[PDB]
Write a protein that binds this ligand. Structure first.
Ligand SMILES: CN[C@@H]1[C@@H](O[C@H]2O[C@H](CO)[C@@H](N)[C@H](O)[C@H]2O)O[C@H]2C[C@@H](N)[C@@H](O[C@H]3[C@H](O)[C@@H](O)[C@H](N)C[C@@H]3N)O[C@@H]2[C@@H]1O
Ligand SMILES: [Zn+2]
Length: 258
């Protein structure tokens, strides 16, 4: 309609009033469809995110390609479309370091290469993943117009709880001039039941909520996400799986994989 185009200074306040603190590590997942309109477009969001964190802060965003038969290059490989414009734009700006593997992240800040310097992580969200370095650095996770279905650290908690299901997934890189398929076993599914973490985090007062632009925003500490999901996965490791009653083809495949 005739909606308010948020300026940079107000976005900073919105970020500060949400819990974003300067000097920290902030991993954000965004759906710009819910943020818009902004006065400066998707760049205006990125500019505010780094303006609130300050120079001593480090902004981290997903930056993987999502393609399994195409090799990855941090200089050209576009972000998968499901990650949004903000993700696809952030890694192209000056001084934004990027991982050199298909499941790459993008980071900018004094701790950037502390986060993205690992080689190909198998599984994609293992320890020694960018998402695990955010955990190790006590970073924050900012859900930006997206639910916990996009919360990547939730998958890190799965492997940290030694979850039984492992489904065969693959990617490809360039080894000495030629392709090669790299087969691994990932712990993915529909990820719909990741929304269960909303009640888990909220009941423990671990999740900050509020507006960032027009989007609904969820801010949770990375270590608080892992810890919360650990205790819940320690109660039932299959709690993120759809029951066979629901007839979810994705989860039923993970279930059959012990
Ligand atoms: C094509 N690569 C992948 C595909 O694997 C494929 O495997 C077979 C061959 O390889 C194909 N025949 C089959 O069509 C397809 O299933 O499975 C899906 C599973 C879905 N949860 C999501 O994963 C998530 C990732 O697992 C997660 O690491 C990341 N955060 C983002 C994605 N949402 O996107 C991937 C991606 O689309
Ligand atoms: Zn499912």
């Amino acid at each position: 309609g005739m909606q308010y185009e948020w300026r940079k200074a107000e976005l900073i306040g919105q970020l500060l009033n949400l819990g974003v603190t300067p000097g920290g590590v902030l991993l954000v997942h965004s759906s710009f469809r819910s943020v818009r309109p902004l006065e400066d477009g998707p760049l205006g969001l990125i500019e505010a995110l780094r303006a609130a964190l300050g120079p001593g802060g480090t902004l981290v965003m997903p930056s993987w390609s999502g393609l399994d038969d195409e090799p990855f290059d941090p200089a050209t490989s576009p972000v998968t479309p499901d990650l949004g414009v903000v993700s696809d734009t952030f890694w192209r700006l000056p001084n934004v370091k990027r991982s050199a593997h298909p499941f790459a992240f993008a980071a900018a800040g004094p701790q950037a290469e502390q986060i993205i310097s690992d080689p190909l992580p198998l599984p994609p969200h293992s320890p020694a993943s960018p998402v695990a370095r955010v955990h190790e650095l006590d970073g924050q996770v900012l859900l930006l117009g997206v639910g916990h279905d996009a919360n990547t650290t939730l998958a890190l908690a799965e492997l940290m709880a030694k979850v039984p299901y492992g489904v065969p997934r693959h990617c490809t890189i360039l080894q000495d001039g030629k392709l090669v398929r790299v087969d691994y076993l990932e712990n993915d599914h529909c990820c719909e039941r990741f929304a269960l973490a909303d009640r888990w985090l909220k009941e423990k007062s671990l999740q900050k909520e509020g507006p960032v632009g027009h989007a609904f925003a969820r801010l949770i500490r990375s270590r608080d996400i892992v810890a919360t999901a650990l205790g819940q996965l320690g109660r039932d490791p299959l709690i993120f799986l759809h029951p066979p009653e629901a007839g979810c083809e994705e989860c039923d495949a993970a279930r059959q994989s012990i």
